[PDB]
Coordinates of C-alpha atoms and ligand atoms in Angstrom, one line a residue:
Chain L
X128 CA 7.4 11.7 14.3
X129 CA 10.5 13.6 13.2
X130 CA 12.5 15.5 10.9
X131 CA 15.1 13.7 9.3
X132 CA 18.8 14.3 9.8
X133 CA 18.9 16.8 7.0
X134 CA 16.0 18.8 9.0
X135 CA 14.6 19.1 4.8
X136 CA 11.7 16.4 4.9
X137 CA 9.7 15.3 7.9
X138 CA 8.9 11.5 9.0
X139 CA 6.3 10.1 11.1
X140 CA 4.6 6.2 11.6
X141 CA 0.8 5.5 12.3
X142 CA -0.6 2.1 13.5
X143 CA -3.5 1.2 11.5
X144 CA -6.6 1.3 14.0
X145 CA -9.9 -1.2 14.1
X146 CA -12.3 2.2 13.1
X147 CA -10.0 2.9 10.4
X148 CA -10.3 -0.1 8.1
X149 CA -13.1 -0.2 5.4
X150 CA -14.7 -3.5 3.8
X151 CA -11.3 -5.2 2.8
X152 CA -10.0 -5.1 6.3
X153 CA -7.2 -2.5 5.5
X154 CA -7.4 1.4 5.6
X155 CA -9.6 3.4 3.4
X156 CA -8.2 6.0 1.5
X157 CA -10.1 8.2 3.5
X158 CA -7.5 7.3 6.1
X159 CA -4.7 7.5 4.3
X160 CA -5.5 11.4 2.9
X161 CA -6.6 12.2 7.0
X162 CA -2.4 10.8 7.6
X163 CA -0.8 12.5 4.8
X164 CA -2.5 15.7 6.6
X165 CA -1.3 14.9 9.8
X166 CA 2.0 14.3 8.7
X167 CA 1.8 17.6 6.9
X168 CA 0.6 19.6 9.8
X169 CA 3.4 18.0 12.0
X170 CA 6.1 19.0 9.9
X171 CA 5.0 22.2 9.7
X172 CA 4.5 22.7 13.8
X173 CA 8.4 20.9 13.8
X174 CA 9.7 23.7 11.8
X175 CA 7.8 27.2 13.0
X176 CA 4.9 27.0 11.4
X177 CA 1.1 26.7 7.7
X178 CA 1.2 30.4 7.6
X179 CA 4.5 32.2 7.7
X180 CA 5.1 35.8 9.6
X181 CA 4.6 37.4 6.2
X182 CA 1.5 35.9 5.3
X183 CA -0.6 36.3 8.4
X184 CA 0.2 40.2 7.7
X185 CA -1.5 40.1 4.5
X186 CA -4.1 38.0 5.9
X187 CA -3.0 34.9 3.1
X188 CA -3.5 31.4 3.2
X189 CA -2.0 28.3 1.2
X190 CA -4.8 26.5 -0.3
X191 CA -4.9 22.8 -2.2
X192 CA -5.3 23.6 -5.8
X193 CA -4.6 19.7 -6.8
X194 CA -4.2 16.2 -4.8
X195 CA -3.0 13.0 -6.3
X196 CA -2.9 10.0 -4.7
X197 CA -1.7 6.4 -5.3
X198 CA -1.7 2.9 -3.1
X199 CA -0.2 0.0 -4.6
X200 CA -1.3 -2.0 -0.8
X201 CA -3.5 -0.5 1.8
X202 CA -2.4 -1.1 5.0
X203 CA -4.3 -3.8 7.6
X204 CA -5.4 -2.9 10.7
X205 CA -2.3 -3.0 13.0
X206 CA -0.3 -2.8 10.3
X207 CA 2.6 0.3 10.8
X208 CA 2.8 2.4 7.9
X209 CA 5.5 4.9 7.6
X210 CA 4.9 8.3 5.6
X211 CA 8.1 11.1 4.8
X212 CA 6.7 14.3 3.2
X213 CA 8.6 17.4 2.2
X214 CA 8.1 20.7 0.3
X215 CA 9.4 22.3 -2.7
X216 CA 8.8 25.8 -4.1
X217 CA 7.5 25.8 -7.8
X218 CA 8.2 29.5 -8.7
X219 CA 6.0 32.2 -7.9
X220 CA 2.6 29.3 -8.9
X221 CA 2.7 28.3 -5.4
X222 CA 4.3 25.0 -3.1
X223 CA 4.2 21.5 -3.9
X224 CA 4.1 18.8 -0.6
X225 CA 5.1 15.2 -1.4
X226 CA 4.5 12.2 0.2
X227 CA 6.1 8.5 0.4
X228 CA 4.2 5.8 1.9
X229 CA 6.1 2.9 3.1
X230 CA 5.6 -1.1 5.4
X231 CA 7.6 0.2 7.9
X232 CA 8.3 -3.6 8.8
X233 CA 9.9 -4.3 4.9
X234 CA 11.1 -0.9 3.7
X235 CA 9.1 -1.2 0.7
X236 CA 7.3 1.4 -1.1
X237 CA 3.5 1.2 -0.5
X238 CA 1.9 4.4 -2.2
X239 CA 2.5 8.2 -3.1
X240 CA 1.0 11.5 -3.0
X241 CA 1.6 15.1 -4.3
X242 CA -0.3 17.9 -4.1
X243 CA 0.2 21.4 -5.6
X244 CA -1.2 24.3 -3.1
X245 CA -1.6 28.1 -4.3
X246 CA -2.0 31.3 -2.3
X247 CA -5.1 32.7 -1.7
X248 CA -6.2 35.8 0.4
X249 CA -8.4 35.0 3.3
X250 CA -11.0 37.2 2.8
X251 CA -11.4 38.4 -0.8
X252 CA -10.8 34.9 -1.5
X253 CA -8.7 35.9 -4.5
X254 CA -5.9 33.8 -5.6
X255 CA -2.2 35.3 -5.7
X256 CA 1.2 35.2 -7.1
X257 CA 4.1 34.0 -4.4
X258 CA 5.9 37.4 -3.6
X259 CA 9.8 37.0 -3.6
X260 CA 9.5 38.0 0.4
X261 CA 7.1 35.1 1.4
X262 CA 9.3 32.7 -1.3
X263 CA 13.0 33.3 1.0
X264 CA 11.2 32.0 4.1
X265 CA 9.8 29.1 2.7
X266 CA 12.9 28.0 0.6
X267 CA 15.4 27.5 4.0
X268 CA 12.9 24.4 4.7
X269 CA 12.8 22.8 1.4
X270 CA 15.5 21.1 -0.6
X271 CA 16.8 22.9 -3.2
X272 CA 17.8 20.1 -6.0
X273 CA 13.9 18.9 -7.1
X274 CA 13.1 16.0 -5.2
X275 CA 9.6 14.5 -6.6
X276 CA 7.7 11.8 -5.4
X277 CA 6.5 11.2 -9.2
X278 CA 9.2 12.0 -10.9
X279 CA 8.4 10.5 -14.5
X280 CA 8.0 12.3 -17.8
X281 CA 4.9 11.4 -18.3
X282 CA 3.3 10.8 -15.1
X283 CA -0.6 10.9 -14.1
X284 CA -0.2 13.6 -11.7
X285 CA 0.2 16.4 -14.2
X286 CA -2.6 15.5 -16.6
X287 CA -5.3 18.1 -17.7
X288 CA -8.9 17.0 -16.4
X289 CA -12.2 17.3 -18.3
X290 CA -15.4 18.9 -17.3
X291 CA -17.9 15.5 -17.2
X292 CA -21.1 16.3 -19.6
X293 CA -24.3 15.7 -19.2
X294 CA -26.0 12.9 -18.2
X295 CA -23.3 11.6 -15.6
X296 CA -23.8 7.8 -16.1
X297 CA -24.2 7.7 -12.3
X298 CA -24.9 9.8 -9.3
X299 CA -25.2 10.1 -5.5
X300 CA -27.8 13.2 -4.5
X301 CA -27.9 16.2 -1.9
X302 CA -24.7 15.1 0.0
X303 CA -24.3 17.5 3.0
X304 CA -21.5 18.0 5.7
X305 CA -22.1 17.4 9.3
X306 CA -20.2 18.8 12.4
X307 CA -17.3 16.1 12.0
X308 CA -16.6 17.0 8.7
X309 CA -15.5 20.6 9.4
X310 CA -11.9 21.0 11.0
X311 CA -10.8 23.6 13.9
X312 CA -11.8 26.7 11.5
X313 CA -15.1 25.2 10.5
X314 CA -14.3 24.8 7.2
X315 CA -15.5 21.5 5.2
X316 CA -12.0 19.1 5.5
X317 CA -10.4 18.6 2.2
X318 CA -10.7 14.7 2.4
X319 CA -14.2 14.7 2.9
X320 CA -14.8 15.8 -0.7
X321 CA -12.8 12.6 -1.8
X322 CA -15.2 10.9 0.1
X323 CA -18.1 12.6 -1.8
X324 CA -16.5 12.1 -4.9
X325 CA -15.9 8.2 -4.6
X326 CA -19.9 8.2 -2.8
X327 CA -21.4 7.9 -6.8
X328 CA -18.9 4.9 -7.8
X329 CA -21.4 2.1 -8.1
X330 CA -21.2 -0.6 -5.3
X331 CA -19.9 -3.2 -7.7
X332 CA -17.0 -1.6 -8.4
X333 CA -16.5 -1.2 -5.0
X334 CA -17.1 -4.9 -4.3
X335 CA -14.8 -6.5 -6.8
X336 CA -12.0 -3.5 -7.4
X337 CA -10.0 -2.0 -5.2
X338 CA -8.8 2.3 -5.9
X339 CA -5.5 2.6 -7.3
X340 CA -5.2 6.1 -8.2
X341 CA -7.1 9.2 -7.2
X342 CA -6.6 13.0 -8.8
X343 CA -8.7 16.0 -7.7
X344 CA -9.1 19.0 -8.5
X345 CA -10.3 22.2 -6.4
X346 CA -12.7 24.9 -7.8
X347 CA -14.4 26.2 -4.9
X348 CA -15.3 26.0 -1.2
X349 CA -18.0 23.7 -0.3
X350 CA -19.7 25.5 2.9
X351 CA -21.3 24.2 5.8
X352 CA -24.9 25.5 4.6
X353 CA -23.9 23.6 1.1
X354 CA -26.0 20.7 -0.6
X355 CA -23.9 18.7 -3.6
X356 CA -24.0 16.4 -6.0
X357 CA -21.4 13.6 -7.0
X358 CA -21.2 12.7 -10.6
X359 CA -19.8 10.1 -12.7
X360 CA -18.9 8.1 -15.8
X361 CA -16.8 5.5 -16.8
X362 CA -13.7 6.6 -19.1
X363 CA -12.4 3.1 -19.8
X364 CA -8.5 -5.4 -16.4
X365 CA -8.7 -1.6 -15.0
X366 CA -11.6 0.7 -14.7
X367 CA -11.1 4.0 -15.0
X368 CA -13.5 6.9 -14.0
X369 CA -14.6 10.7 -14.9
X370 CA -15.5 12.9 -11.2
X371 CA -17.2 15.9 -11.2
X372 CA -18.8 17.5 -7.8
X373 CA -21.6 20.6 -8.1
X374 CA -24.1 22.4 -5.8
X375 CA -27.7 21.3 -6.1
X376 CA -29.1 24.0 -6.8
X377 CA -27.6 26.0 -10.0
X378 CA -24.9 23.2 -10.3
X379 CA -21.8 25.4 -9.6
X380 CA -18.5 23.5 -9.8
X381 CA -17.0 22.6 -6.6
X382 CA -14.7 19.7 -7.9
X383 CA -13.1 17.9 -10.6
X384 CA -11.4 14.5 -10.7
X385 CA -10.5 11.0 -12.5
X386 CA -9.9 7.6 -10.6
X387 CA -8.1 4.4 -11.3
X388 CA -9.2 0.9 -9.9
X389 CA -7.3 -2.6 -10.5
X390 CA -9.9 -6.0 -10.1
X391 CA -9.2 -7.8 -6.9
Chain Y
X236 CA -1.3 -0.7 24.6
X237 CA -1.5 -3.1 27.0
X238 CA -3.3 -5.4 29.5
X239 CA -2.5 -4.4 32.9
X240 CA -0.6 -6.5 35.7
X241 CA -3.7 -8.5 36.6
X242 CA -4.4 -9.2 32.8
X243 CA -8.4 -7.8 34.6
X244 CA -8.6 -4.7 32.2
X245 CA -6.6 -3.0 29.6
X246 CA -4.7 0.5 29.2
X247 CA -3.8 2.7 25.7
X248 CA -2.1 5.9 25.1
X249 CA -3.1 7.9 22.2
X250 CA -1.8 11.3 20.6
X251 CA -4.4 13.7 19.6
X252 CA -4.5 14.6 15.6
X253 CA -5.0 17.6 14.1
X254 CA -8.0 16.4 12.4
X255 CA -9.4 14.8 15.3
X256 CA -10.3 18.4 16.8
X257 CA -13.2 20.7 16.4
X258 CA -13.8 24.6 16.4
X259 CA -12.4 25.0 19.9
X260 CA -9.3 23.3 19.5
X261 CA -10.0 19.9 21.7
X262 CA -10.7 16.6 20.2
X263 CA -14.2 16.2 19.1
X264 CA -16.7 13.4 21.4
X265 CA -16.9 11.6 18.0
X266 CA -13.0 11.5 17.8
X267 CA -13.2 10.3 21.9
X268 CA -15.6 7.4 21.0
X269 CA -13.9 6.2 18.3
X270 CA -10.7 6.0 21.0
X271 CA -12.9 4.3 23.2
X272 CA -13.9 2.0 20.4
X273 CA -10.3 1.0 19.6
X274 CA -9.3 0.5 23.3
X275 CA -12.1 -1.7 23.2
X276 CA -11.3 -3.8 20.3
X277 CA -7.6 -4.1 21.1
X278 CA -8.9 -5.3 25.0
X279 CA -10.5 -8.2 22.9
X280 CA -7.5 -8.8 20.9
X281 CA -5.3 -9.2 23.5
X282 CA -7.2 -11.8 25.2
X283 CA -7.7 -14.3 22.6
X284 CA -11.0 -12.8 20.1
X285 CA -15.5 -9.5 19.9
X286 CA -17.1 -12.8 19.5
X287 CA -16.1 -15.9 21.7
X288 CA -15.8 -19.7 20.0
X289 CA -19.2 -20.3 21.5
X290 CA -20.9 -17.6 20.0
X291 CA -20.0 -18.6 16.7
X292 CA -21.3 -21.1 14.9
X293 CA -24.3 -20.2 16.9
X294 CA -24.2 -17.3 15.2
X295 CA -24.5 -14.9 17.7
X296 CA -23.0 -11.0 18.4
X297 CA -22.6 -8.4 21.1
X298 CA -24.7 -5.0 20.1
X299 CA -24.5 -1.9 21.4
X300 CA -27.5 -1.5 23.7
X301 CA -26.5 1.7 25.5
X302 CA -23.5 4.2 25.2
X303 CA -23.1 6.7 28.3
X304 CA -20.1 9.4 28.0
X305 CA -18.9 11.9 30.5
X306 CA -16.4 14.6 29.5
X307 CA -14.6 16.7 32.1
X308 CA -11.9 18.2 29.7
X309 CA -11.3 17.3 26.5
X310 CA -7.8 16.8 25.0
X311 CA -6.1 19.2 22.8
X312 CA -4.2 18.8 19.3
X313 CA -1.0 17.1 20.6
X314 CA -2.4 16.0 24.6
X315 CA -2.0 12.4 25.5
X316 CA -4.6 11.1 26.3
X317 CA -4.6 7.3 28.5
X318 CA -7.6 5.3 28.7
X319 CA -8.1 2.1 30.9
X320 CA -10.9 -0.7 29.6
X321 CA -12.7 -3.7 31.3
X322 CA -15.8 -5.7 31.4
X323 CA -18.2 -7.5 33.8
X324 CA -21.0 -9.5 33.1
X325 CA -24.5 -8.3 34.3
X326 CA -26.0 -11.9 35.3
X327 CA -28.1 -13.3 31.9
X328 CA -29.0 -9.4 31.0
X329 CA -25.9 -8.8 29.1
X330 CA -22.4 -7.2 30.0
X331 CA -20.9 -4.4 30.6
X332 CA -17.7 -1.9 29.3
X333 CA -16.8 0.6 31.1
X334 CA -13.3 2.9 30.3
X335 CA -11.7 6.0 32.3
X336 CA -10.2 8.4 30.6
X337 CA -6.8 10.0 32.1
X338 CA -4.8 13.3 30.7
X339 CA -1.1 10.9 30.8
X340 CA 0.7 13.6 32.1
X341 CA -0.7 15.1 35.1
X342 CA -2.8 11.3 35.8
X343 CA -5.9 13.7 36.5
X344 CA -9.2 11.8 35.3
X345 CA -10.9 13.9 32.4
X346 CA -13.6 11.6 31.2
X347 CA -15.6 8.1 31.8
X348 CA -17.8 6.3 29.7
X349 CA -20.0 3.0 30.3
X350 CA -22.0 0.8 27.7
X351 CA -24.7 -2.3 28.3
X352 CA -24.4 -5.0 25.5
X353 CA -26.7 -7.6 24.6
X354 CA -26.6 -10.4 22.7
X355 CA -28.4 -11.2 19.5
X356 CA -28.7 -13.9 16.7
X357 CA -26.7 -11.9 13.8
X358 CA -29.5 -13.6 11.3
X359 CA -33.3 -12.9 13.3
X360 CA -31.9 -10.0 15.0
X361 CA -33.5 -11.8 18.3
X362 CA -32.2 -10.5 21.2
X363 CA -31.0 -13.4 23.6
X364 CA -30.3 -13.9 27.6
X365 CA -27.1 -14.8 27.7
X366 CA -26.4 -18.3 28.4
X367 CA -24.2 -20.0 31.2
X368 CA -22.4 -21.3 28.5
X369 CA -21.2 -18.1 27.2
X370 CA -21.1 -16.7 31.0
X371 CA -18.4 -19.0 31.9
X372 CA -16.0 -17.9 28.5
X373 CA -16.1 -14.6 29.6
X374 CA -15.5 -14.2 33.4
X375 CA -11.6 -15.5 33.0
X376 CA -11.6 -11.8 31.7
X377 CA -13.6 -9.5 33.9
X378 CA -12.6 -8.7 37.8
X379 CA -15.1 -10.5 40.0
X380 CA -15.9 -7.9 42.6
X381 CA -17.6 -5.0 41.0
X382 CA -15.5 -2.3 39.6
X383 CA -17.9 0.8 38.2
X384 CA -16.8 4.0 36.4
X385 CA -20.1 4.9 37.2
X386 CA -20.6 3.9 41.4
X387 CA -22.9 6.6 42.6
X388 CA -26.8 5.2 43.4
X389 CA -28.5 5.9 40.6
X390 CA -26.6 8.2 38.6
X391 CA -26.9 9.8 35.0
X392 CA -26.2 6.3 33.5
X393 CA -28.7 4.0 34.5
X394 CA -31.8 6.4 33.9
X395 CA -34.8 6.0 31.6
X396 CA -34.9 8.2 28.7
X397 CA -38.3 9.5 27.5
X398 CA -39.8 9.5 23.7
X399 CA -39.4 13.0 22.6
X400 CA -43.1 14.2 20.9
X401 CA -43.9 16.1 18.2
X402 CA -43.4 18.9 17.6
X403 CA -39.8 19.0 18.2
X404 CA -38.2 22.3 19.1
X405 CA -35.5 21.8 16.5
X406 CA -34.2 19.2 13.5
X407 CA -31.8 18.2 11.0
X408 CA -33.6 15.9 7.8
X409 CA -32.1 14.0 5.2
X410 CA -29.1 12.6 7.3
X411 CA -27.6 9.9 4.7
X412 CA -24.4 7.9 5.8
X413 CA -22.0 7.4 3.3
X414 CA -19.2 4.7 2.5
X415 CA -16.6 5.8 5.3
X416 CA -19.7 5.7 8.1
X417 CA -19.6 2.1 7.6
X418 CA -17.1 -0.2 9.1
X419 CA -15.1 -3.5 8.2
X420 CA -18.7 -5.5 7.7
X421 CA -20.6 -2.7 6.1
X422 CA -22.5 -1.7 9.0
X423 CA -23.0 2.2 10.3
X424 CA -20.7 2.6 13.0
X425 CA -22.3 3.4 16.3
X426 CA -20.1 6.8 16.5
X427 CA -21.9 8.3 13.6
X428 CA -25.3 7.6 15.5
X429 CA -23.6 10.5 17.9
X430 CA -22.9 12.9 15.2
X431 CA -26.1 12.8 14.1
X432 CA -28.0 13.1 17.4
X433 CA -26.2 15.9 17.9
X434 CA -26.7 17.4 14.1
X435 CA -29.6 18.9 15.4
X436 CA -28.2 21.3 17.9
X437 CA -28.5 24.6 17.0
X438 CA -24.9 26.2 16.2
X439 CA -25.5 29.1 19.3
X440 CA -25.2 26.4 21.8
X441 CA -22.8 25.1 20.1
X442 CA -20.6 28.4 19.8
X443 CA -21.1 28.7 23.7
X444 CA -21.6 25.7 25.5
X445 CA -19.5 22.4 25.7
X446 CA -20.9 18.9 25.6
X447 CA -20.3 17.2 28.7
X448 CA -22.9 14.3 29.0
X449 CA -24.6 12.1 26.4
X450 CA -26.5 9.3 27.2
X451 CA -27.4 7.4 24.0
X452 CA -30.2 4.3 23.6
X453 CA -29.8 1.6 20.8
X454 CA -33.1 0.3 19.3
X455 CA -32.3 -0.6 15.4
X456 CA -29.9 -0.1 13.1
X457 CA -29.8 2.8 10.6
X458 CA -29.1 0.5 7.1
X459 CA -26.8 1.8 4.4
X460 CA -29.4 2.8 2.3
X461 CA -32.0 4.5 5.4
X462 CA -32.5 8.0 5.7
X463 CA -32.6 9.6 8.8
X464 CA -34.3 12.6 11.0
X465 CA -32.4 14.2 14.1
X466 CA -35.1 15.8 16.7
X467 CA -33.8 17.8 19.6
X468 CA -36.1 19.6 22.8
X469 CA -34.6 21.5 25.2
X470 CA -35.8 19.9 28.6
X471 CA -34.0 22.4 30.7
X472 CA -26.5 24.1 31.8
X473 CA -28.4 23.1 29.2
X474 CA -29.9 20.0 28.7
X475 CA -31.9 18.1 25.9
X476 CA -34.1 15.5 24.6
X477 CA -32.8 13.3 21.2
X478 CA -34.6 11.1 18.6
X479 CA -33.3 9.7 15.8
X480 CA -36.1 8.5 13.6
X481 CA -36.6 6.8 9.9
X482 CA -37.6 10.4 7.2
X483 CA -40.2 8.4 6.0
X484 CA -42.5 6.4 8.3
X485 CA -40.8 7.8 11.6
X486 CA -39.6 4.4 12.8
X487 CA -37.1 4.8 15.7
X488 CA -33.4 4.3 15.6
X489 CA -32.1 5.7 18.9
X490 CA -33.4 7.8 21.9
X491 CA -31.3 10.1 24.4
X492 CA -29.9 13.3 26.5
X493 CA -27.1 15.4 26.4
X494 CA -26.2 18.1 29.2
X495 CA -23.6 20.9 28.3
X496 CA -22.0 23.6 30.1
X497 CA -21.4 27.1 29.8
X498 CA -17.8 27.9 28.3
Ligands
2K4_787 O1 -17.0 5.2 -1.6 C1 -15.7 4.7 -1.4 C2 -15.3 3.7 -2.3 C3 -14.0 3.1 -2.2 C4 -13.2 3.6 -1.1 C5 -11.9 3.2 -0.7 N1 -11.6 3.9 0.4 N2 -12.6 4.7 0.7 C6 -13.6 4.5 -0.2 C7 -14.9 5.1 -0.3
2K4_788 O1 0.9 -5.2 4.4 C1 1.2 -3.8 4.5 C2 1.9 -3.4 5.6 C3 2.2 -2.1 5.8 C4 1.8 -1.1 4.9 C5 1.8 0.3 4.7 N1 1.2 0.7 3.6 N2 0.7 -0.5 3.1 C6 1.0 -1.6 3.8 C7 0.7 -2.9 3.6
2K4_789 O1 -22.7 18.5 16.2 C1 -21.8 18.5 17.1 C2 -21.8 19.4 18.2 C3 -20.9 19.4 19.2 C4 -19.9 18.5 19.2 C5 -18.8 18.1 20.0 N1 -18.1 17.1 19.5 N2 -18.7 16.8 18.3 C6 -19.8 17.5 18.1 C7 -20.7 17.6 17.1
2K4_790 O1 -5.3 19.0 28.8 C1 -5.7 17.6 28.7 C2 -4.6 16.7 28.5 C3 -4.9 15.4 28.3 C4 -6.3 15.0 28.4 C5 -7.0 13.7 28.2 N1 -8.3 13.9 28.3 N2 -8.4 15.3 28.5 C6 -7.3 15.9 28.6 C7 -7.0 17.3 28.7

């Protein structure tokens, strides 16, 4: 990978592998979130980093408050998919990191991504402002005319999502992490809640749909010691679908979300 | 990748991810058999298939027997990592993998694996001695002398691996797999059989010790809708005893040992 000749966004292309592919023979978007974070964290390395000076003083952390994601085609296995991400400052609510998937052979646009990420003290765990200081560092690395990867008025990645009542028409039961799902800090990895998340869609969906678009939402930290459940109803050619993730026990929110999925 | 000059085995390079390491910074031995698992599909690839004409129609598969892995050093976020693959056949018993893992940079050898196939009628699930037929489509492939990651006279490898009794010094229940433990044909992949032999380690010897040798045994497959049990005794570096087992009538899925060293 590289940064582009600007040095203000960050590209990088991944051959799809035989472990990577799901049921349809092309990647799952379990490998698509696992290379829009490797992408991320190699942009980051490329540019000093994703801590800066300022916040590991003040013991603060950037954490995903929101990640949307949408494929229009999944790539096959040995396919080469390209992916150019970049960051923008959104005031003092926190940083915004986009994505553009792309057939590296055609040019053509294959899916997109953003996430919105907030600060958050390491410790207290309490969620912060973006001080003016910690703001300058950032901004030299982003571009300073907006540059969205959903730029539309009305687009899906801004929408307000609803608490899912009770009964959830489905549900997938005392889902724990193992050792693979934590990364270097043993934390739980952020795509392994999509995972969770998309374990209660009902097998026939699966089978005859494939998942357009994905939004989710971040409440809390799911810990290693952690039991949850995955819950979900239908909302709705397209099916569309109501997400909500809670610990077993007292049912504390951990997630919120809403999918999209086009018949095959 | 690519096959080497001889067109005998075949040789990858792969970049470690960041979320392909664990808590110490080094690729995980789940992220490592995964690797070995696509060196080992693209070997087939290149040399016209993991299933030969033959095979099919008599609808017959390779499965997984028994996976042995030995870990010198493990790469880092970033490391290249290069990894040669080949196969032999072992007479009508089955045949063979083997792979050698190198650190690209320095050519130092930081790892080998080897693994025994067998084949079996995809429908019965009846294990089968391989036929001359099939013998015949498959040595154009492998070098005829014997080549061995493994050499030494009866090494780690090749030995028998007792059935761990009850009751076990330690366990993890409940072990379910989801959607992304499955693969292309919605079966478990045989990596997360690892990940959950290993579950049951406790997190001290985790904290302090690095996994250097697993030896892993192959009797049934874990369905998607199976529960499983993960039963570890310490028969000691520190070594153990595994068994994975069905939560309810205690039905075996796989058997094996793992030996890790101080860090
Ligand atoms: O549980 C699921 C269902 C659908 C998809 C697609 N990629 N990953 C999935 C996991
Ligand atoms: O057929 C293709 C080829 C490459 C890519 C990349 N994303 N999606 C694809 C589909
Ligand atoms: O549960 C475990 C424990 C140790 C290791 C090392 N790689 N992966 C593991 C999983
Ligand atoms: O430090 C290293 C560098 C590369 C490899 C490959 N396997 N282990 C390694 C360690």
């Amino acid at each position: 990978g590289s940064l582009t000749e600007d040095g203000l966004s960050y590209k990088e292309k991944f051959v799809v592998r035989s472990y990577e592919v799901g049921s349809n023979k092309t990647a799952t978007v379990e490998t698509i979130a696992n290379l829009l974070q490797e992408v991320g964290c190699n942009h980051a390395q490329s540019v000093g980093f994703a801590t800066t000076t300022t916040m590991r003083k003040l013991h603060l952390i950037w954490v995903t408050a929101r990640m949307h994601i949408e494929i229009y085609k999944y790539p096959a296995w040995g396919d080469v998919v390209e992916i150019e991400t970049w960051c923008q400052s959104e005031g003092r609510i926190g940083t915004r990191r986009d994505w553009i998937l792309k057939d590296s052979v055609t040019g053509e646009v294959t899916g997109r991504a953003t996430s919105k990420w907030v600060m958050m003290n390491q410790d207290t765990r309490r969620l912060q402002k973006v001080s003016d200081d910690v703001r300058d560092e950032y901004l030299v690395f982003c571009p300073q005319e907006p540059r969205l990867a959903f730029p539309e008025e009305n687009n899906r990645s801004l929408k307000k999502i609803p608490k899912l009542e009770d009964p959830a028409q489905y549900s997938m039961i005392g889902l724990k992490p193992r050792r693979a799902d934590l990364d270097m800090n043993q934390h739980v990895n952020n795509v392994t809640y999509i995972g969770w998340v998309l374990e209660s869609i009902p097998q026939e969906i699966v089978d005859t749909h494939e998942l357009q678009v994905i939004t989710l939402d971040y409440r809390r930290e799911c810990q290693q010691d952690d039991v949850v459940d995955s819950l979900t109803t239908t909302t709705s050619n397209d099916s569309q679908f109501l997400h909500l993730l809670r610990l077993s026990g007292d049912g504390q929110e951990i997630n919120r979300g809403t999918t999209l999925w086009r018949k095959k």
